[PDB]
Structure formats: structure tokens, C-alpha cells
Amino acid sequence: AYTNSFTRGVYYPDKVFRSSVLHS
Amino acid sequence: GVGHQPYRVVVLSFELLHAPATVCGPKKSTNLVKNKCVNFNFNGLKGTGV
Ligand SMILES: *[C@@H]1O[C@H](CO)[C@@H](O)[C@H](O)[C@H]1NC(C)=O
């Protein structure tokens, strides 16, 4: 069986704090 | 021969990650001064500011 993953599967790539920014 | 003799070797591997660090040499920690332009050192990070 299969199902839609949607927008799941996003983690923090590093432990550096960033605020109000669009980061690649 | 000298090269064929046994050698005890230790390789030290270390990480420059920005996690809270734990392993470093004996350095005295001074008092904290706020709201003043001072030089500062935090876990080997050097800077100058308020
Ligand atoms: C994902 O799975 C569903 C059900 O198995 C199927 O209808 C759909 O076509 C699949 N989509 C892709 C992109 O594989």
C-alpha cells in the first residue's frame, strides 16, 4: 500500500539559530 | 630495520561543529560584563563588541 507524503519530512539541517530569514 | 619496527600510533579526530563544546585546555573564565564595548572569547570564538 502507498499514501501521499505531503509536506512531511523536513528537519533542521544544523543547530545554528536563524530568525526571520529564507535560507537555502 | 627501522621502518619494519612496530609503532604505536594514535590518531586524534576532532569536530568543528557548532554544538556546545566540552573538550578544551585550562583557560580561566573571567567575570561577565554587559552593556560595554569589550573584547570577548566564548568557546574559542573571539570577537569585540557589546
Ligand atoms: C501514489 O500512490 C497512489 C496510490 O498508490 C497513486 O494513485 C498515485 O498515482 C501515486 N503517485 C505517484 C506520483 O507515484
Curated annotation (Swiss-Prot), chain A:
Top-level lineage group: Viruses
Function comment: Attaches the virion to the cell membrane by interacting with host receptor, initiating the infection. The major receptor is host ACE2. When S2/S2' has been cleaved, binding to the receptor triggers direct fusion at the cell membrane. When S2/S2' has not been cleaved, binding to the receptor results in internalization of the virus by endocytosis using host TFRC and GRM2 and leading to fusion of the virion membrane with the host endosomal membrane. Alternatively, may use NRP1/NRP2 and integrin as entry receptors.
Subunit structure: Binds to host ACE2. RBD also interacts with the N-linked glycan on 'Asn-90' of ACE2. Cleavage of S generates a polybasic C-terminal sequence on S1 that binds to host Neuropilin-1 (NRP1) and Neuropilin-2 (NRP2) receptors. Interacts with host integrin alpha-5/beta-1 (ITGA5:ITGB1) and with ACE2 in complex with integrin alpha-5/beta-1 (ITGA5:ITGB1). May interact via cytoplasmic c-terminus with M protein. May interact (via N-terminus) with host bilirubin and biliverdin, thereby preventing antibody binding to the SARS-CoV-2 spike NTD via an allosteric mechanism.
The protein's name in its UniProt record: Spike protein S1
Naturally occurring in which organism (per UniProt): Severe acute respiratory syndrome coronavirus 2 (2019-nCoV)
Upper lineage: Viruses, Riboviria, Orthornavirae, Pisuviricota, Pisoniviricetes
